[PDB]
C-alpha cells in the first residue's frame, strides 16, 4: 500500500543516516569501500561474501532492506568478514578486529537508542505479509 511504502521510505532515510555516521568515522575508513585486489590480493580468496559501507548504501537505495534486521545482517557481515580475515595476533590484525567490533557495537547502539521498537515491528509485519 501507499502507507506501507511511506513506512519503508522512513526506514531507508533512517538507515542512510546511520550508515553515513559510520562512514565518516575515521576508525571505520577500512570498511567504507570494497577491498582493492591490487592492494590486498589474497582477500577475494579468503572472504567469499565481501561487504562494505558503500555497498550497504547501494542496497538501501535498491530497496533491499525492509527491516533493520536485514540491515544489521550486513553490518554483522562487515564485522565477521574482518574478524575472519584478521585472525592473527599481529598488531595490524588486532587493530582491524578492534575497529570491526567497534563498528558493530556502534551500529547496534545507535539503533537501540534511536529506532522505535514499534516502528521496527511494523516493518517486520509488512515484510512477513509479502
Ligand atoms: C577489510 C579488511 O578486513 C581488511 C582490509 S586489509 C586487512 N588486513 C591487512 O591489511 C593485514 C592482514 N594480516 C596482515 C597484517 N594486516 N583486512
Curated annotation (Swiss-Prot):
It comes from the Eukaryota. Induction: Up-regulated in breast, uterus, colon, ovary, and stomach tumors. Induced in breast cancer cells overexpressing NCOA3 or treated with estrogen. Down-regulated in 5-fluorouracil-resistant derivatives of the colon cancer cell line HCT 116. Residues 108-130 form a coiled coil. It is found in: Nucleus. Residues 3-114 form the Bromo domain. Highly expressed in estrogen receptor positive breast tumors and in osteosarcoma tumors. Belongs to the AAA ATPase family. May be a transcriptional coactivator of the nuclear receptor ESR1 required to induce the expression of a subset of estradiol target genes, such as CCND1, MYC and E2F1. May play a role in the recruitment or occupancy of CREBBP at some ESR1 target gene promoters. May be required for histone hyperacetylation. Involved in the estrogen-induced cell proliferation and cell cycle progression of breast cancer cells. Interacts with ESR1 and NCOA3 and these interactions are enhanced by estradiol. Interacts with acetylated lysine residues on histone H1.4, H2A, H2B and H3 (in vitro). This is ATPase family AAA domain-containing protein 2. It comes from Homo sapiens (Human).
Amino acid at each position: 500500500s501507499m502507507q506501507e511504502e511511506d513506512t519503508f521510505r522512513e526506514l531507508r532515510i533512517f538507515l542512510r543516516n546511520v550508515t553515513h555516521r559510520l562512514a565518516i568515522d575515521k576508525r571505520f575508513r577500512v570498511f567504507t569501500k570494497p577491498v582493492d585486489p591490487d592492494e590486498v590480493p589474497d582477500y577475494v580468496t579468503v572472504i567469499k561474501q565481501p561487504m562494505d559501507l558503500s555497498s550497504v548504501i547501494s542496497k538501501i537505495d535498491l530497496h533491499k532492506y525492509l527491516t533493520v534486521k536485514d540491515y544489521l545482517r550486513d553490518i554483522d557481515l562487515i564485522c565477521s568478514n574482518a574478524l575472519e580475515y584478521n585472525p592473527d595476533r599481529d598488531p595490524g590484525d588486532r587493530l582491524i578486529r578492534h575497529r570491526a567490533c567497534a563498528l558493530r557495537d556502534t551500529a547496534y547502539a545507535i539503533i537501540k537508542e534511536e529506532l522505535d521498537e514499534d516502528f521496527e515491528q511494523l516493518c517486520e509485519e509488512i515484510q512477513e505479509s509479502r
